[PDB]
Design a binder for these strands. Structure first.
Length: 849
DNA sequence: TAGGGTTTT
């Protein structure tokens, strides 16, 4: 055993702590307590009964409202506002199956509608059902919820259906995404919402008694949420016979979902796109005649293939397929040539290039921007080149989607962001690398990695679709048909990659107490060892006890829309009066960071983050300081110049502020804060005490610790608590820095790409880990007295301080158990404040002088 | 010295 720095406290400080704890130890209405015990006493039968009396609103119908929307509908279908709209609707393929669909929903509880894009299933199926209920005289019985995976889609689709119905948004159709809603009228209505909104509303209505029809869309994408939702539909619908659900899918393994719902009726609706011709690597080379020069395991794939096409291609075209670099995007000069080829031949239209990630977008941007070849210098002035990437600004401006200036052709260099998330309408040509990046969590080594991999057949068909929204397009795939043959059908469904602590906790609020049982029933059941790992984390942070039952703390965490570790950090900041900086750290880690990474400016972005960090050695507090500067930028009417000079996204910052207010308002509702305003003076009496903020951050990120050992920009010898050598990710503020006041760090995410990096980190102090961690014991090892945390990191510590810290931890354990069970703000002049002050005192010993 | 992409009453 190695022994770290001494953490013993002075006599005078220890005496004040003993007095504070002894004043805390002379202390003698809980709606929450009653609800927590009620959840733990009832079995599932009682819980289904009890939720059916409490959610009874749609037992009530209004016949005069029914009668008036019926008559109003019949005559507004004689106006010429509509009836232009209505015959333009009838040109969508879905509307010819209108009556077959109405009849199928009436006769069956679950149906499935399969259709390619342009078929109108999302637009039309909700209104076919809605207008049928209104026509039949049953308007007020009808409440239609239709889920979508992405926030942008729920809005645009709702604004479209509202237009198709000659209404301002909010009367018959509405949308609800998180922290923004234009709600439809209460009854006879269609609401589009993200799947996550629906999932949060089960906590209050777990058997879906507040809607009459549920439509799940784009389920073939196998997001965690809709895969989760279908699992719970098999629990709910045996108890909701009147509820109608309509599954909706693209033609991507349609049959899986039909199989799941044992064999339900399945419609196939034709689509509307223009033909997109597909070329593979052998076809591109025979048209570009490009030549390369500056493992294998390749040959066994390509040489059989080269014999079955031998008479369909020139022999020299086939010999380039023998090169492993011809495949994918290993040679960017070859992608630049195919861009140059489309510019000379092959008439008007924008080019959409899919490359895996930032590094290879940067490469092809620079070859087209500052060409080395004369062929490319030819074309530099006649291309308007746009990189597209979720950390780049181009998506949140308006030029990437408008048509290019006269005499210039648009070239978009994009990651998979342009497959579904972002949409460009005048694209005619797609260059499909066939390579993207994916995250791989390995249960065996607990190493999450970011690897470049081949795309799936579902992927390439989506990319080919992006070429046929305007004209017949062309799609070039930079890989052979032999490579396509060995591609997977779909990407790994993401629930097999995710960690489950958040889901397991959410299930216990739906009275699904065994997660091994229920998770085994999804389409793709996760590794039961991942569940074991999720449960052990939830046991560690004490959201479940050691028999696995929900604790009072765990019930509050389950009700916060944020991963449960960061949920805990937010509660802590409510009881330790540092709420505004800590909810900033939490929001940013759950959402993304507000900094762009524009091309060519990486070293300048490094300076900005270094300056916003104010030398506090933490990526988390850096964000909070960025947010403090953004508010001052707005108070100053200098917001756009501030965002310009610092490479920050206004819209991300404005979203992080809506999230911090959501957290404080939730905490105010749960009786943990006196005020809902997260910048309130009383909730932030300690918000400037930097050592205390590292303590609360660590209380959330624990047990993700790392210890630093050497120096030299600088070279770091560092390792996580488990012994693996790590480094800070170069995008982190602590990469390469020299002279840390402490050698210990906490982190949210470890990731291997070129090395094992920490993507974010805060420098932390040993006494903070001791107070808020576990695995704390006192003893002697060489002949010196120690005190340790996680039984991993051992610190020299006198026996007077170790006696006080152990007794201080035991009172902190008791205080948290009380505030979870009987929520109230900590009163500024009471017994519980005395314990808090004891902790403020100890941690303050580590401020930089 | 490096950053696939969604999303939460």
């Amino acid at each position: 055993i190695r022994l770290g720095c001494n953490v013993s406290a002075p006599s005078g400080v220890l005496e004040r702590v003993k007095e504070l704890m002894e004043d805390y130890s002379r202390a003698p209405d809980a709606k929450f307590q009653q609800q927590f015990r009620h959840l733990l006493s009832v079995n599932f039968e009682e819980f289904v009964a009890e939720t059916k009396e409490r959610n009874a609103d749609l037992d009530w119908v209004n016949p005069k409202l029914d009668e008036r929307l019926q008559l109003e509908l019949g005559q507004r279908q004689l106006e010429e506002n509509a009836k232009k709209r209505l015959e333009a609707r009838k040109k969508l393929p879905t509307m010819k199956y209108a009556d077959d669909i109405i009849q199928a929903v009436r006769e069956n509880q679950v149906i499935l509608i399969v259709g390619s894009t342009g078929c109108g299933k999302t637009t039309q199926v909700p209104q076919i059902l809605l207008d049928d209920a209104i026509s039949r005289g049953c308007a007020s019985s009808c409440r239609i919820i239709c889920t979508q995976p992405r926030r942008i889609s729920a809005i645009a689709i709702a604004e479209w259906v509202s237009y198709e119905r000659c209404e301002s948004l909010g009367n018959s159709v509405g949308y609800q995404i998180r922290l923004e809603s234009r709600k439809a009228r209460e009854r006879a209505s269609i609401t589009y919402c993200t799947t996550g909104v629906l999932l949060q509303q089960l906590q209050s209505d777990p058997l879906m008694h507040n809607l009459s029809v549920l439509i799940l869309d784009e389920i073939h994408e196998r997001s965690v949420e809709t895969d989760l939702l279908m699992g719970l539909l098999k629990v709910i619908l045996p108890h909701r016979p009147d509820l109608k659900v309509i599954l909706m899918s693209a033609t991507v393994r349609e049959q899986d979902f039909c199989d799941y719902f044992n064999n339900c009726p399945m419609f196939r609706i034709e689509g509307v796109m223009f033909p997109v011709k597909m070329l593979y690597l052998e076809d591109v080379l025979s048209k570009t005649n490009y030549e390369f020069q500056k493992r294998m395991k390749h040959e066994a794939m390509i040489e059989p293939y080269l014999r079955r096409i031998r008479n369909s291609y020139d022999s020299r075209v086939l010999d380039k397929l023998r090169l492993p670099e011809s495949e994918g995007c290993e040679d960017i000069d070859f992608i630049a040539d195919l861009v140059y080829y489309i510019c000379e031949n092959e008439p008007e239209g924008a080019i959409l290039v899919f490359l895996p990630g930032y590094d290879k977008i940067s490469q092809l941007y620079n070859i087209l921007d500052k060409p080395k070849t004369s062929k490319g210098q030819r074309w530099r002035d006649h291309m308007a080149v746009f990189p597209l990437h979720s950390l780049m600004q181009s998506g949140e401006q308006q030029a990437v989607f408008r048509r290019p200036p006269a005499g210039q052709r648009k070239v978009i260099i994009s990651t998979i962001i342009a497959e579904t998330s972002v949409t460009i309408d005048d694209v005619v040509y797609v260059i499909n690398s066939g390579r993207t990046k994916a995250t791989n969590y390995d249960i065996e080594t607990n190493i999450q990695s970011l690897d470049e991999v081949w795309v799936t057949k579902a992927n390439t068909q989506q990319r080919r679709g992006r070429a046929g929204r305007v004209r017949p397009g062309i799609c070039y795939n930079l890989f052979s048909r032999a490579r396509e043959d060995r591609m997977d059908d779909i990407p790994t469904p993401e629930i097999l990659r995710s960690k489950l602590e958040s889901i397991i906790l959410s299930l216990k609020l739906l009275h699904i107490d065994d997660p091994y049982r229920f998770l085994q029933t999804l389409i793709n059941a996760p590794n039961p060892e991942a569940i074991k790992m999720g449960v052990e984390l939830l046991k560690r942070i004490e959201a479940l006890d050691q028999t696995g039952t929900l604790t009072p703390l765990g019930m509050h965490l389950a009700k916060l829309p944020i991963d449960p570790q960061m949920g805990k950090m937010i509660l802590m900041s409510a009881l330790f009066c540092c709420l505004d900086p800590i909810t900033s750290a939490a929001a940013a880690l759950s959402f993304k960071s507000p900094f762009y990474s524009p091309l060519g400016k990486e070293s300048r972005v490094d300076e900005i983050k270094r300056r916003m960090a104010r030398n506090m050695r933490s990526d988390h507090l850096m964000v909070h300081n960025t947010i403090i500067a953004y508010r001052d930028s707005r108070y100053s009417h200098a917001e756009r110049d501030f965002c310009y000079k610092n490479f920050l996204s206004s819209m991300t910052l404005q979203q992080l502020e809506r999230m911090k207010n959501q957290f404080s308002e939730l905490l105010y509702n749960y009786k943990f804060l006196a005020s809902s305003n997260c910048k309130d003076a009383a909730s932030n009496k300690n918000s400037e005490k930097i050592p205390l903020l590292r303590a609360i951050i660590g209380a959330g990120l624990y047990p993700n610790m790392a210890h630093l050992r050497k120096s030299r920009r600088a070279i770091h010898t560092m390792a996580t608590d488990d012994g693996r050598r790590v480094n800070f990710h170069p995008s982190s503020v602590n990469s390469g820095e020299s002279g840390f006041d402490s050698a210990y760090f906490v982190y949210f995410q470890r990731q291997k790409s070129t090395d094992l990096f920490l993507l974010d980190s805060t420098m932390v102090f040993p006494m903070a880990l001791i107070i808020f961690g576990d695995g704390v014991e006192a003893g002697v090892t060489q002949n010196t007295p120690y005190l340790c945390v996680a039984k991993t990191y051992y610190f020299k510590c006198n026996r007077e301080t170790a006696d006080v810290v152990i007794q201080l931890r035991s009172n902190l354990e008791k205080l948290l158990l009380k505030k979870a069970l009987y929520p109230a703000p900590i009163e500024e002049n009471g017994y519980e404040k005395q314990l808090i002050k004891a902790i403020e005192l100890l941690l303050s010993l580590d401020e930089r002088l």
